[PDB]
Design a protein around this ligand. Structure first.
Ligand SMILES: CC(=O)SCCNC(=O)CCNC(=O)[C@H](O)C(C)(C)COP(=O)(O)OP(=O)(O)OC[C@H]1O[C@@H](n2cnc3c(N)ncnc32)[C@H](O)[C@@H]1OP(=O)(O)O
Length: 157
């Protein structure tokens, strides 16, 4: 009754997926579209949880490459539709992503950073780890986007 699919195989879901993400972290629709359009059959890849008929996008996560780690990825923008939270759908899509990374992508580790929901990831098997940057040296983070509450976690697949 539910499916998890890469967004690039079902672009008709992109508009609903943008609204899902933007309802949580407000950005332009175009900015979210650029991210969804980057999804491909390696990395990065956006996965969406939907109903059987694909008439509602229940959840979304994005898997991003890590410049210094060819056998790992970073998961970000994990969001479940506000109508359907607390019902196991976040757990569902995260477990699917882990199988997907291990089996389809042959990856060994998933990393993430969070500010307030490390208790969610701890419950589903993630562990705190040392800091790690998604980008390589050819990237400068805007200082206004740094936050002291950022905690890092990983799960060995
Ligand atoms: C890397 C990043 O993207 S961090 C930002 C994470 N995303 C967000 O904050 C966006 C808004 N929030 C959401 O979309 C959702 O609430 C999520 C993704 C945080 C969790 O999805 P949900 O569907 O609501 O959680 P889910 O039903 O699957 O519950 C998983 C378990 O973790 C627990 N749990 C859920 N959220 C939290 C939390 N914030 N803190 C501690 N424990 C939690 C639940 O009790 C549940 O326990 P159980 O396995 O024993 O039944």
């Amino acid at each position: 009754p539910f499916n998890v699919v890469p967004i690039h195989n079902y672009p008709e879901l992109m508009k609903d997926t943008c609204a899902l993400i933007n309802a949580e972290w407000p950005r332009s629709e175009t900015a979210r579209m650029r991210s969804l359009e980057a999804s491909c059959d390696s990395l990065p890849c956006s996965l969406v949880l939907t109903t059987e008929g694909m008439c509602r996008v229940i959840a979304h996560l994005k898997l991003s490459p890590i410049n210094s780690k060819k056998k790992a990825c970073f998961v970000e923008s994990v969001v479940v539709d506000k109508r359907h939270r607390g019902q196991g759908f976040g757990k569902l899509i995260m477990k699917f992503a882990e199988d997907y990374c291990r089996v389809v992508l042959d990856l060994k580790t998933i990393y993430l950073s969070t500010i307030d929901q490390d208790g969610f990831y701890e419950r589903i098997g993630y562990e705190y780890c040392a800091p790690i940057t998604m980008y390589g040296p050819r990237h400068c983070e805007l200082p206004s986007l740094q936050n002291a509450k950022k905690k890092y976690m990983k799960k060995v697949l």
